[PDB]
């Protein structure tokens, strides 16, 4: 399971890194 280097949130392979960046590191 992948940890994010910025927030240390774990995501599974059924949600991509670029989706993490949009949802959790942009403006909701």
């Amino acid at each position, epitope marked *: 399971v992948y940890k*994010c*280097e*910025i*927030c*240390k*949130m774990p995501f599974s392979v059924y949600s991509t890194l670029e989706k993490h960046m949009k*949802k*959790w*590191h*942009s*403006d*909701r």
Partner: nanobody
Amino acid sequence: SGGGLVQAGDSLRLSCAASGSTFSGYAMGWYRQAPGKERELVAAITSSGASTYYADSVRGRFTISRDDAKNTVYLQMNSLKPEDTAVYYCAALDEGYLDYDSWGQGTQVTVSS
């Protein structure tokens, strides 16, 4: 109101507040430094407040919330376990990796059983 020393089953509520409106437009997260481990993201909340993350260990028990008007973020901690013992911090998710030094001060929570 005295300190963070409590016993299991007890509940506590943490707040993190800053001057101005800095937390607005940023997702916020509660972090903890338990003895032995590195940072753990315990809970997070998107910028709008529409979405929410919880670490497995605390899911069901902890609750995160934000009030951009007061520039304040909250973590309601029910049913504390001894494994919840740590220093707690809040930060911008864009800053979760920065040195503890550049973060705020942090509060101990110390659970007993």
